[PDB]
């Protein structure tokens, strides 16, 4: 009935707002169709490393982005007060609707 999409660049973390959200649900109202992993899109930025000439040099950086699903089936006006006001985690992104 309500799923919350989750994304951040750090993994040893996103699954900590995951297992916090999930937890702050089953204990309260409950239900939650477990936390789903879901394709972690990894951008790759590769650029020349010398201030001038040397096209063979270059650094190869990346940005891993991680997803987590959530899915809570039983929206208990209590678990609604359990998502809200029991949250935070600055570097994570939450999407309530779809």
């Amino acid at each position: 009935r309500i799923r919350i999409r989750l994304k951040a660049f750090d993994h040893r973390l996103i699954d900590q707002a995951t297992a916090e959200i999930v937890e702050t649900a089953k204990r309260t109202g409950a239900q939650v169709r477990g936390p789903i992993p879901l394709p972690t899109r990894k951008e790759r930025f590769t650029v020349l490393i010398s201030p001038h000439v040397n096209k063979d040099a270059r650094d190869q950086y990346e940005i891993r982005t991680h997803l987590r699903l959530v899915d809570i089936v039983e929206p208990t006006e209590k678990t609604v007060d359990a998502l809200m006001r029991l949250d935070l985690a600055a570097g994570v992104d939450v999407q309530i609707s779809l």
Binding site: T46, D56, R58, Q60
Partner: protein
């Protein structure tokens, strides 16, 4: 019960289901032929039934995605010897000697900056 073996090889991954029956072979809802029995290595999908017999004894409906013509026929070949799991481990020794048991871990090697392609090095002249 469905007695299973996975198997996979370079980008492909095939799942092989066993069940004593006939000598018929399903894959991606296809005949052995209608998929690639009539291309390079039809014989190799059947291969995992050499020192271990069939000719019409045991059935095998399977699927497989990813990779290509011979990666998929490698994946499946692995899955068959993997399914021969259930039929004891007595048979899974001349399946070793066969080589069919091993996971062919050979992967496409990356294209690495500075080069043309993995190893291929930009021809150079000194002057």
């Amino acid at each position: 019960n469905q007695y299973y073996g996975t198997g996979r090889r370079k980008s492909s991954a095939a799942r092989v289901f066993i069940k004593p029956g006939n000598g018929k072979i399903v894959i991606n809802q296809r005949s052995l032929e209608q998929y690639f029995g009539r291309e390079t290595a039809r014989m190799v999908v059947r291969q995992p039934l050499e020192l271990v017999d069939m000719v019409e004894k045991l059935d095998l409906y399977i699927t497989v995605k990813g990779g290509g013509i011979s990666g998929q026929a490698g994946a499946i070949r692995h899955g068959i010897t993997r399914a021969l799991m259930e039929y004891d481990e007595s048979l899974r020794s001349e399946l070793r000697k066969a080589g069919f048991v091993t996971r062919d871990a050979r992967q496409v090697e990356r294209k690495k900056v500075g080069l043309r392609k993995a190893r291929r090095r930009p021809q150079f002249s000194k002057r």
